[PDB]
Amino acid sequence: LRVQGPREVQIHLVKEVQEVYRAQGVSIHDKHIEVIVRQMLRRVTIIDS
């Protein structure tokens, strides 16, 4: 997240969450993990005021 950006961190999260399930053949559509991830990036740490 800090190096590449916000667009890339979501891809990594989804890929790593999906691969563990996929190893055992459990088919889960990406959008569920997508919804779970969406709520993880609702806030930003403030620096200057």
Partner 1 sequence: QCGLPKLMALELFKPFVMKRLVDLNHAQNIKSAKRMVERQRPQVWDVLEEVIAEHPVLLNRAPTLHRLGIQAFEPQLVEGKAIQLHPLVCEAFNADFDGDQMAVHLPLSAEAQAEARILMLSSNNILSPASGKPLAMPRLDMVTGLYYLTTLVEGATGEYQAATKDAPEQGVYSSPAEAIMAMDRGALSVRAKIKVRLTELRPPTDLEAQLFENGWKPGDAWTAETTLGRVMFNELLPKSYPFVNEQMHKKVQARIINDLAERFPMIVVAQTVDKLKDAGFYWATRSGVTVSMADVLVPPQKQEILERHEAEADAIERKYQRGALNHTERNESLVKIWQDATEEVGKALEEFYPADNPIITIVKSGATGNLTQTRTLAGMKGLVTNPKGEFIPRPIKSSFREGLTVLEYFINTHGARKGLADTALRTADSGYLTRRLVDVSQDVIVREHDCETERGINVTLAERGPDGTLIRDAHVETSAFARTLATDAVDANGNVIIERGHDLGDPAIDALLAAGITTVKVRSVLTCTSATGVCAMCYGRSMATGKLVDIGEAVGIVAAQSIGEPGTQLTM
Residue 34 near partner 1 by CB under 8 A: yes
Q: How far is the CB of 38 from partner 1 (least distance, A)?
A: 5
Q: How far is the CB of 28 from partner 1 (least distance, A)?
A: 5
Give the DSSP per-residue string, 1-49: --SS-HHHHHHHHHHHHHHHHHHTT----HHHHHHHHHGGGS-------
Query: In this complex, which beta carbon is closest to partner 1, that of residue 1 or of residue 21?
Result: 21
Amino acid symbol at 13: L
Interacting residues toward partner 1 by CB under 8 A: 10, 18, 20-22, 24, 26-40
